[PDB]
């Protein structure tokens, strides 16, 4: 077992490739970007790029950041929820998706489904917290 | 997808050597590891070793631990078993096995024709 | 060095029967099992592994289960394409090793 490097575990199965979640998750907002940049020199033809690329570092990081917030998985890695998994989506048992396939392939077979599960996951939080102030 | 494909048979005088090799083809090669088992004549499958086509990292059974050796050749996609020190008794089919998953695969998805050896 | 010891040698078989193969263990294998079913001129076919997954291909009436030490195969509703002999293996120890074998009389 060694540590890997940013995408170095894209072609391990998800079995080995989930043991290296915070190298990627650890470059998502911060780069030399960010840097003093050495006629305003902010409207020069790379001083319009460099701040246009600032704006999407911004955006990207919290286009994932407001999906997390909505499941109630803020702050964690792995955050585990109460949607059971529909066999639709999916029917592939547990060797044949941790041993047998990488995140990409896994991504693309499910493609299709993405957006109906952010959906449930955004509506299964809202009912938790309904539960929870009509309870306590 | 995928299939293995070994030599003809061989009909080798005690005391010589054999090798046998399996050709892996149409799939990707260095995912599955390859297994070898014989099944002696009227009798049931046994296993030798498991050889892994993408570091080379090989396992051997106590008996041909000092007779068997098996290697693994990358840019043909193709496996190797050599026998050495042929007893009366090693005659048996010899089968290739690809293993189930890429990792932990308990069973063996796709098998060779198999190659019957006289000794 | 687990040896794998399964009976009953032989099972007087017809169409549609309860036909059921025992693999006993001389050590804990746990869920990892595997079983094989072989025709005649035909290398050995996986049909059942981690002892109760089923493998592509094969009709549903196959079934296993049992864990630890005692494993079963059952067969509900046996048809003359279920002949030939099994195996069961063991997947966890440094050697893999085999079954005596058991064959189905139809």
């Known amino acids: 077992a060694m540590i890997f490097g940013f995408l170095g575990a894209a072609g391990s199965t998800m079995g080995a490739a989930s043991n290296t979640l915070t190298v990627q998750a650890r470059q998502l907002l911060s780069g030399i970007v960010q840097q003093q940049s050495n006629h305003l020199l902010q409207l020069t033809v790379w001083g319009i790029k460099q701040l246009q690329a600032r704006v999407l570092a911004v955006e990207r990081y919290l286009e994932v950041q407001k999906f997390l917030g909505l499941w109630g998985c803020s702050g964690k890695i792995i955050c585990c929820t109460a949607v059971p998994w529909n066999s639709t989506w999916s029917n592939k048992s547990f060797e044949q998706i941790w041993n047998n396939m990488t995140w990409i392939e896994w991504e693309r077979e499910i493609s299709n489904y993405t957006s109906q599960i952010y959906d449930i996951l955004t509506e299964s939080q809202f009912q938790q917290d309904i539960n929870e102030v009509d309870l306590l | 997808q995928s299939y293995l494909v070994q030599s003809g048979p061989e009909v080798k005088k005690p005391g010589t050597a054999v090798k046998v090799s399996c050709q892996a083809s149409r799939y990707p090669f260095t995912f599955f590891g390859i297994s070898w088992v014989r099944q002696a004549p009227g009798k049931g499958p046994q296993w030798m070793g498991w050889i892994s086509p993408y570091n080379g990292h090989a396992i051997y059974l106590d008996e041909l631990k000092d007779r068997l050796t098996l290697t693994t050749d990358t840019d043909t996609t193709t496996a190797y078993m050599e026998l050495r020190n042929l007893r009366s008794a090693d005659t048996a089919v010899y089968f290739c096995?690809?293993?189930?998953?890429?990792?932990?695969?308990?069973?063996?998805?796709?098998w060779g024709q198999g190659t019957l050896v006289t000794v | 060095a687990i040896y794998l010891t399964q009976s009953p040698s032989s099972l007087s078989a017809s169409v549609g029967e309860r036909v059921t193969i025992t693999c006993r263990a001389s050590?804990?294998?746990?869920?990892?099992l595997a079983w094989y079913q072989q025709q005649p001129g035909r290398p050995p076919f996986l049909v059942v592994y981690?002892?109760?997954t089923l493998n592509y291909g094969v009709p549903s009436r196959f079934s296993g289960g049992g864990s630890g030490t005692r494993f079963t195969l059952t067969i509900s509703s046996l048809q003359p394409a279920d002949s030939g002999t099994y195996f069961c293996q063991q997947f966890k120890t440094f050697p893999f090793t085999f079954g005596p074998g058991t064959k189905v009389e139809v």
């Open positions: 981690r002892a109760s």
């Open positions: 050590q804990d294998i746990g869920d990892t």
């Open positions: 096995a690809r293993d189930h998953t890429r990792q932990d695969s308990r069973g063996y998805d796709f």
